[PDB]
């Protein structure tokens, strides 16, 4: 199961100054980049075009090129329409894309956030507000739903284009997606808390536990998954122990890349 995400972030400082930046993820791997400075969408992988031909891609990019300009003016015009109820600075975020399932099954989404709060989505054939959204958005929503051409485009984009494009991506980038990178471990201590560092592994699923012989330590607290630049992962597991009890403790690491031979590291 892979989630394809188009993450757009837009900042409106005042009536004139505006910028829109987009990044695109397939799972936890970046496939596209679109800086405000760039007129075109950038491939961050050799297989970012998927199974789309050059003609198909140019037509698709062109639509986004029109969208970015149109979106910017639309927000600006909607701020004028709500004033003085809503005012700059304004932050808008879009989370668009589709999740792929076994068979021909997929599920598309388009979520919109306003000042960091999820308020609007595209659902079915129209825009709608989600539970918790402020009522004033009903005017923007009525205005966006008047635009029949945008509705038909978005419908086709979510229902047809996304799953088609992502099915192509999953074929073209099979190597990268299914890559196996070996974790590397090292130990350290702070004033006492013992730390087991695990870094350089792909994919994300990993098992890290402090061991006293063959008994798993209950106090083992795993930290968050932190990213490396080369698209590998980092994670540390800590254990609080009384000084002197250091001897007999080890760190066992299980990962799909090691293939049975778990990394064992004695203190």
């Amino acid at each position, epitope marked *: 199961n892979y989630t394809f995400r188009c993450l757009q972030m837009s900042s409106f400082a005042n009536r004139s100054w505006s910028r829109t930046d987009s990044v695109v993820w397939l799972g936890d791997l970046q496939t596209h980049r679109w800086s405000n400075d760039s007129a075109t969408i950038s491939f961050t992988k050799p297989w970012s075009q998927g199974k789309l031909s050059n003609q198909q891609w140019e037509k698709l990019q062109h639509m986004f090129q029109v969208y970015r300009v*149109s979106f910017t*003016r*639309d927000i600006q015009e909607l701020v004028k329409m709500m*004033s003085p109820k809503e005012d700059y600075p304004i932050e808008i975020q879009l989370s668009a894309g589709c999740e792929m399932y076994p068979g021909n099954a997929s599920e598309s989404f388009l979520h919109v956030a306003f000042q960091g709060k999820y308020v609007v989505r595209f659902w079915g054939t129209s825009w709608q507000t989600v539970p918790g959204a402020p009522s004033w958005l009903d005017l923007p929503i*009525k205005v966006l739903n008047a*635009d029949q051409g945008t509705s038909a485009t978005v419908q086709m984009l979510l229902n047809d284009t996304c799953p088609l494009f992502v099915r192509g991506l999953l074929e073209a980038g099979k190597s990268d997606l299914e890559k196996q990178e070996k974790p590397v471990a090292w130990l350290s201590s702070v004033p006492r808390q013992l730390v087991c560092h695990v870094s350089g592994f792909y994919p994300k699923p990993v098992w890290v536990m402090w061991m006293r012989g063959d008994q798993e330590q209950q106090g083992t607290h795993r930290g968050d998954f932190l990213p490396n630049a080369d698209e590998t992962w980092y994670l540390q597991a800590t254990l609080d122990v009384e000084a002197g009890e250091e001897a007999g403790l080890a760190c066992r690491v299980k990962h799909s890349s090691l293939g049975g031979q778990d990394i064992i590291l004695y203190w």
Partner: T-cell receptor
Amino acid sequence: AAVTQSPRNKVAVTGGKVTLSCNQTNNHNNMYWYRQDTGHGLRLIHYSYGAGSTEKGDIPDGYKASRPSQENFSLILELATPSQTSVYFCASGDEGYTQYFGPGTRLLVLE
Amino acid sequence: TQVEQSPQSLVVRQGENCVLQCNYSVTPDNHLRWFKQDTGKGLVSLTVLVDQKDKTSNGRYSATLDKDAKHSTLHITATLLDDTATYICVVGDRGSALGRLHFGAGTQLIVIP
């Protein structure tokens, strides 16, 4: 959906105050002011999304707009100039794309 | 000047047909509208074209729109004296009130009775 303009025709002097009024009963939120000059298409001066709201258009200089109510959008020329001699059209519309136009207002500003 | 009309002006004899061209560079192009304007009078809507490759009709008035070529024509069949008017091409960049209308300078038609 009908729109009216008053006056329909005006002769004015430089430095004079000219007010062009536009009334719609369609309960439309949005109203627009255009001017038409031979050899150009209609150009947007000011617009409004609701009462109390006025927005600069493409050629707003020399003009001030007023929206006291949903029914009335008003184009005010504080210091009239000969360059403001034109035919002035007003329009209204709801959330849709269609703008419904008034019959026009002919203005002449003499020295 | 994102909307260009051709011819600038034209003279036809009653009963004859004429074609009026409208070419534009407006982006994006939601709809195209043809106005009729009598000297002195206001803007009477003739037809609005909305589709990628669209065709419309209104009695003696017919029209086409090609969004790829960014081009539209207005055909008048069997011109009458009352056709003497300026014909204006307008392009809306949205399917909603968020849009701006982009006006051509018009095409002047004179029908000789």
